């Protein structure tokens, strides 16, 4: 949320000190969630190695 | 019998993860190979097949 610069909001208000927030799950439960995602949402690569002398 | 280890759990055995069906971890079980009585005192000696190695 940017004041000067309007352009590049993501979000409708601005987070302010004294906000309630909360965790999403069960204390101490171990999970497997499931994901979902675009194509651009990560990459991927790998560097050739060269070989020792 | 099958006797239920409750906080340990399976494992896929490739990837090394935790399996989970969705509910709950899948917990670790074994089986009675063979009959086996208690004596006073109230302790129990009992040969299990499968092993959480």
Redesign the interface.
């Known amino acids: 949320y940017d004041t000067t610069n309007p352009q590049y909001n993501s979000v409708s208000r601005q987070v302010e000190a004294g906000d309630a927030v909360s965790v999403v799950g069960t204390a101490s439960?171990?999970?497997?969630p499931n994901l979902f995602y675009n194509k651009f949402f990560c990459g991927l690569g790998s560097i050739p190695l060269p070989k020792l002398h | 019998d099958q006797v239920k280890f409750t906080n340990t759990y399976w494992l896929q055995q490739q990837t090394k993860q935790a399996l989970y069906n969705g509910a709950t971890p899948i917990s670790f079980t074994a089986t009675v190979t063979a009959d086996a009585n208690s004596d006073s005192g109230g302790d129990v000696t009992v040969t299990l097949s499968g092993v959480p190695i």
Not at chain 1, 29 to 32: A, F, G, L, P
């Open positions: 439960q171990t999970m497997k």
